[PDB]
Amino acid sequence: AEFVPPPECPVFEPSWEEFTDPLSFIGRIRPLAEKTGICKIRPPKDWQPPFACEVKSFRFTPRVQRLNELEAMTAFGFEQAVREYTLQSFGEMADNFKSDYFNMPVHMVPTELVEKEFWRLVSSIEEDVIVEYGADISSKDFGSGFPVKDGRRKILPEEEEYALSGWNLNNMPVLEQSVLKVPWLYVGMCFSSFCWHIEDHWSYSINYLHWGEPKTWYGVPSHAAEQLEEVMRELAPELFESQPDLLHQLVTIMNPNVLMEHGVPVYRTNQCAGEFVVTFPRAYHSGFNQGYNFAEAVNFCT
Ligand SMILES: CN1CCC[C@H]1CCO[C@@H](c1cc2nccc(C(=O)O)c2s1)c1ccccc1Cl
Ligand SMILES: [Mn+2]
């Protein structure tokens, strides 16, 4: 009955010589990481970029997420309106929610317990849990989490190495080669989540957790992409089974154990603060946040 955690995805701890640039490093770990869909990269201990967002003016209006909206299928539409938070007020709400839900301090809740409870609530018909996710935040609004030589914020000399680092997500190559843009920010709370999807143009994605509680990931290697899609449309509601992929993946919520029972390989990881997660081309991924955190992500091409 309880959720069975998938096997762990690869974690790489490159030395300073192995940490030269992401594109060269990702190309070398590709033979292994492409067979798991996702991988985690822990930078050297001394690589600690400062948080360079405008915290004083950071204001956002997160989306409302009903965990059991798909199982609730079998007044609607006015359950909770989308409201504005500051970055401080969102953290107070997030910490209060998690501590009250588990009856424990937020830092004492085991990651396995949040994981087991998240997947129970997704399929629960007797308990309706509703959370919020600050998912629509462009780095052009209040600045990137990384220091950027933009001219709209002061950069200290000890922070210039991070403004010029290849692992700064603002310095990733994003232009696709053809005959014929900026990172996004994610302010999470406990149970806020994203369902199974791949990137537009089957692009890579790189994700950095600036601070906060871990972000739990699930990934499927690209060689099983068509197997996952077949399981999805087999078990999806009939009203959504015929929808185009770009629209269907707005509601492709599925317990990883269900995919594993159908033979789909799934890997998991807990991304901690200061760690990177890379998703490979056509690697389906999903996840949820363990608590109040702040992430930055961008799609890149090779
Ligand atoms: C791409 N759109 C640009 C602005 C924000 C974003 C809006 C939608 O967002 C994706 C997400 C994809 C994704 N991929 C990797 C990691 C995370 C994470 O939350 O850490 C996320 S969220 C998503 C997908 C399904 C369900 C919920 C969400 Cl929110
Ligand atoms: Mn994604």
Report how far ligand 1's centroid is from the alpha carbon of 135 (Å): 6
Q: Would you state the structure tokens that stand for residue 272, as one six-digit string?
A: 């901690």
In order of start, what are the domains of the chain with their CATH numbers?
1-302 (2.60.120.650)
**Buried b / exposed e along 20-41 (16+ C-beta atoms within 10 A):** eebeebbeebeeebbbbbbbbb
Give the technique used to solve this structure.
Answer: X-ray
CA distance 264 to 59: 40
CA distance 68 to 126: 10
Report how far ligand 1's centroid is from the alpha carbon of 47 (Å): 26
Is 205 known to sit in a ligand binding site? yes
CA distance 64 to 88: 18
Question: Which ligand number lies closest to the CA of residue 189?
Answer: 1
Say if CB 219 and CB 283 are below 8 A apart: yes
The answer to whether the CB of 114 is under 6 A from ligand 1 is: no
Question: Which ligand number lies closest to the CA of residue 249?
Answer: 1
CA distance 279 to 84: 31
Is 133 known to sit in a ligand binding site? yes
Say if CB 171 and CB 165 are below 8 A apart: yes
CA distance 144 to 147: 7
Among 194, 206, 249, name the best residue to mutate to test ligand 1's pocket (greatest count of ligand atoms within 8 A of Cβ): 194
Report how far ligand 2's centroid is from the alpha carbon of 191 (Å): 17
Report how far ligand 1's centroid is from the alpha carbon of 194 (Å): 6
What does the DSSP assignment read for the chain? Answer: ----PPPBPPEE---TTTTS-HHHHHHHHHHHHTTTSEEEE---TT--PPP-S-TTT-EE-PEEEETTTTTTT--TT-S-----EEHHHHHHHHHHHHHHHHTS-GGGS-HHHHHHHHHHHHT-SS---EEEEEEEEEHHHH--SS--TTSSS---GGGHHHHS-TTSGGGS--PPP------EEEEE-TT-EEEEE--GGG-EEEEEEEEES-EEEEE--GGGHHHHHHHHHHHS-HHHHTS-HHHHTTS----HHHHHHTT---EEEEEPTT-EEEE-TT--EEEEESSSEEEEEEEE--
CA distance 63 to 133: 5
276-279/204-212 β-pairing? antiparallel
Give the position, in ligand 1's atom list, of the atom nearest the Cα of 186.
19
What's the reported resolution, in angstroms, to a tenth? 1.5
With a CB cutoff of 8 Å and minimum separation 6, the contacts of 300 are: 23, 172, 173, 174, 203, 204, 205, 206
The answer to whether the CB of 216 is under 6 A from ligand 1 is: no
